[PDB]
């Protein structure tokens, strides 16, 4: 339905900053009428076409269209949409538990069983999207949030659908976007895009989650892109000495250039590392640990 033309401030209390993109600013908010808390995403609108600042009507309407479709316990929910002269404001589910990687860095120990549990949460959210032919296109640790960091096993919420796109039958979608470190070769090569790009990103997130190291990240953006296109990564024993074989197989099957060869979200969920076939493989996963020393070190370096 239409965006609300009323003043956001007239119906919402505005609190602290939660974050921002280049073209958006997210703030904690409360609906005066209900007393309920949400997050208000203020997206700056473009003036005409050649504007350096602002997001286009098409891109704003796409994000809204996608968010209005999604109702899943591992995905952020949309509440309301407002529009003024400068901004289109998205009223979203309040997510305030911080980044998953922040929480993990806090743990005294982490087993691969625990790790897979969090990974499955992401996989469950992505599956829901992919079933609806929706690609997220921006899967990275920043966009992997939690509701509450104070329950034993926190619940993951996938956020920021600014780059999300509905995959159409027989329509070629080609674009260059996202954070270099996490993008699939087809993005870099300006080649047809689909749901496969998300699966590559999951492989990168898993890699970092288990090691602290990033598979393709170089000294510069130039190096990073060269590594991605040539698929040049390793399981160095400095970072992967504790890692199980199935964990490496899971990643190895996700970091594949050929899109048709890469695991689908369904194939990823069935994979023995996520889903043990017998008690043996379940116990191997249970006893395998993540070196949080390396994970923590590298995460603080991201701060």
Residue 194 assigned to a binding site? no
Alpha-carbon dihedral angle through residues 67, 69, 75, 77, given to the nearest 10 degrees: 60
Burial class of residue 166 in the structure, from the number of CB atoms within 10 Å of its CB (0-12 exposed, 13-18 middle, 19+ buried): middle
138 in catalytic set: yes
Residue 125 assigned to a binding site? no
Residue 228 assigned to a binding site? no
User: Residue 290 forms beta bridges with which residues?
Assistant: none
Residue 21 assigned to a binding site? yes
- CA 127-252-207 angle, to 5 degrees, is 75
User: Among 178, 205, 157, 135, which residue's Cα sits nearest to residue 21?
Assistant: 178
Active-site option among 13, 80, 124, 138: 138
Strands (E), the chain: 12-20, 24-31, 36-44, 78-83, 87-93, 134-135, 144-146, 156-158, 165-166
Q: Is there a contact between 94 and 39 (Cβ–Cβ < 8 Å)? A: yes
Residue 22 assigned to a binding site? yes
Residue 197 assigned to a binding site? no
- CA 247-250-253 angle, to 5 degrees, is 145
DSSP helix/strand/coil, 65: helix
Sign of CA dihedral 167, 172, 177, 180: positive
Residue 98 assigned to a binding site? no
Residue 241 assigned to a binding site? no
- Just list the catalytic residues: 138
Residue ranges for the binding site for ATP?
Answer: 18-26, 41
């Amino acid at each position: 339905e239409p965006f609300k033309q009323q003043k956001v401030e007239d119906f919402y209390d505005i609190g602290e900053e939660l974050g921002s993109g280049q073209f958006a600013i997210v703030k904690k908010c409360r609906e005066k009428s209900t007393g309920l808390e949400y997050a208000a995403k203020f997206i700056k609108k473009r003036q005409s076409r050649a504007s350096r600042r602002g997001v286009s009507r098409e891109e704003i309407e796409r994000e809204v269209s996608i968010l209005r479709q999604v109702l899943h316990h591992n995905v952020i929910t949309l509440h309301d949409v407002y529009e003024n002269r400068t901004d289109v404001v998205l009223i979203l589910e309040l997510v305030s538990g911080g980044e998953l990687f922040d929480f993990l860095a806090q743990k005294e120990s982490l087993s691969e069983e625990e790790a897979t549990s969090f990974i499955k949460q992401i996989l469950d959210g992505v599956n829901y999207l992919h079933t609806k032919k929706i690609a997220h296109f921006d899967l990275k640790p920043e966009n992997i949030m939690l509701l509450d960091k104070n329950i034993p096993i926190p619940h993951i919420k996938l956020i920021d659908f600014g780059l999300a796109h509905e995959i159409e039958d027989g329509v070629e979608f080609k674009n260059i976007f996202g954070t270099p470190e996490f993008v699939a070769p087809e993005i870099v090569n300006y080649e047809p895009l689909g749901l496969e790009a998300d699966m590559w990103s999951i492989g990168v997130i898993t890699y970092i989650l288990l090691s602290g190291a990033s598979p393709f990240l170089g000294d510069t953006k130039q190096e990073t892109l060269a590594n991605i296109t040539s698929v040049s990564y390793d399981f160095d024993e400095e970072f992967f000495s504790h890692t199980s074989e199935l964990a490496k197989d899971f990643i190895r099957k996700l970091l594949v250039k050929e899109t048709r060869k890469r695991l689908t979200i369904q194939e990823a969920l069935r994979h023995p590392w996520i889903t043990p076939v017998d008690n043996q493989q379940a116990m191997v996963r249970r006893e395998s640990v993540v070196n949080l020393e390396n994970f923590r070190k590298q995460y603080v370096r991201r701060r």
